[PDB]
């Protein structure tokens, strides 16, 4: 409010946060040396035991990004989750150290991107399964995904699937994160066993059994009983199943699900409707 007794008020904040002041030189020092991106799938899981928060959010992150300090982004996220200002004994340092560890283990897209890139890739088709819970809907679907192709876009396929199924949008940013998760956890298990990604010669037993065989002329149509797995099912669950899901070298057999704690947002599907209302009231009663 300007009609006052002539103070100097530097940066009257919106909500409780000071405005983000950029550098504007590191932005140009980074945006001009901008070869690649290398998105990182990041998983956050915490329980009421060994932790106090729950914080089941999953996000992508640019590994080559040296602009944003990660502790500032985590401190902005905890303020977005409406945690009160005692948020350091329920540390931002724990989440910051988890995200700092998860981007250090990310070995990147291997020699399929680094050294060579065969146009069309290889026959390495993997069996992607996903299991997403949003609100009271559960998307369960499996398909095949070539991990050996560089021009396979997970986001352009996630938008395509949520176009056909008319999904709200949490499934847009959960399907692509699941693709980026499982493709990376197969690439890491390939790279730690010394795969030498140009000449294939896969030569293992746990993998080469997860990989799918070569499609012949006859196998260009899948069998009918085998077809009923490769189809998207959006089941509806009630409060009992929702309470049952609320408690319960990389292991490629344990494929995690994407449950997310809801953000306190009014309009968006997938978030609780706490806070300021749609109608603009104050309700001064007598």
């Amino acid at each position: 409010i300007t009609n006052t007794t002539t103070r100097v008020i530097p940066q009257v904040e919106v909500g409780n946060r000071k405005h983000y002041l950029e550098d504007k030189l590191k932005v140009y020092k980074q945006a001009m040396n901008e070869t690649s991106e290398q998105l990182v799938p990041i998983r956050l899981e915490f329980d009421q035991d060994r932790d106090r928060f729950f914080l089941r959010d999953t996000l992508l992150w640019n590994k080559n990004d040296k602009l944003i300090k990660i502790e500032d982004f985590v401190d902005d996220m905890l303020r977005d989750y409406r945690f009160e200002d005692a948020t350091r004994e329920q540390h931002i340092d724990t989440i910051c150290q988890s995200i700092q560890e998860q981007i250090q283990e990310f070995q990147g897209n291997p020699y399929i991107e680094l050294n060579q890139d065969r146009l069309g890739g290889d026959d390495l088709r993997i069996r992607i399964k996903l299991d997403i819970v949003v609100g009271q809907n559960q998307l369960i679907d499996q398909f095949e995904w070539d991990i050996s192709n560089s021009d396979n876009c997970p986001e352009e396929f996630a938008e395509s699937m949520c176009q056909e199924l008319e999904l709200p949008g949490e499934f847009v940013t959960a399907i692509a994160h699941s693709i980026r998760e499982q493709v990376h956890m197969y690439h890491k298990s390939l790279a730690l066993l010394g795969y030498n990604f140009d000449g294939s010669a896969i030569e293992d037993d746990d993998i080469r059994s997860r990989m799918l065989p070569t499609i012949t002329l006859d196998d260009v149509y899948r069998p009918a009983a085998e077809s009923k797995i490769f189809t998207p099912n959006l089941l509806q669950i009630s409060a009992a199943e929702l309470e049952r899901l609320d408690k319960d070298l990389p292991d490629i057999a344990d494929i995690p699900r994407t449950f997310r704690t809801p953000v306190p947002s009014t309009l968006m599907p997938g978030g609780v409707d706490v806070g300021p209302s749609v109608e603009s009231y104050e309700l001064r009663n007598t």
């Binding site: 106090r52 099912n233 929702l242 104050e282």
Partner: protein, 167 residues
């Protein structure tokens, strides 16, 4: 007052759709304990619309082959209802007297691809009809179009319209 002037005087001067937790006191108690980092007794989902997209408990790949119509063929060396128009009795019978069991597996998947596409088209239309009423409901519009108002009310701004001096 003369009618030669009356015509010129005015000429010269013309003067059950959402799936949230509908109790508005458990959602607040959920966030009041969530900032502390505590669970609660009741459950709370995110908001959405109702409706289930249930496939494979619906139209299946049909069974146009018999129990042994492929291995015996291996030994002997061989307008719309849902999405397909109903054929006449005599015209389709000679058409199915033409084909081979190399193409029966093609035909089954072609008809399943028609069935699943229709069963996705109608559910997609119903889903768009539901989302168009979700977005209106979450924005203050009712459907299908002592309180004190905040400054972010339609018509209750603080920036009053200042008038020019000639007006």
């Amino acid at each position: 007052l003369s009618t030669n002037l009356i015509s010129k005087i005015s000429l010269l001067r013309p003067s059950p759709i959402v799936t949230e937790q509908p109790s508005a006191e458990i959602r607040e108690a959920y966030i009041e304990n969530f900032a502390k980092g505590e669970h609660i007794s009741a459950i709370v989902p995110g908001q959405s619309i109702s409706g289930t997209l249930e496939l494979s408990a619906q139209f299946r790949v049909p069974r146009y082959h018999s129990k042994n119509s492929f291995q015996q063929a291996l030994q002997m060396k061989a307008q719309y209802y849902r999405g397909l128009p109903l054929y006449e009795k005599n015209t389709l019978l000679e058409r199915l007297k033409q084909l081979t069991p190399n193409e029966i597996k093609e035909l089954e998947h072609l008809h399943d691809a028609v069935f699943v596409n229709t069963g996705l088209q109608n559910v997609r239309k119903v889903r768009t009809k539901k989302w168009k009423k979700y977005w209106q409901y979450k924005a203050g519009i009712p459907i299908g179009l002592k309180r004190v108002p905040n400054p972010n009310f339609l018509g209750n701004c603080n920036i009053k319209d200042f008038k020019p001096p000639y007006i």
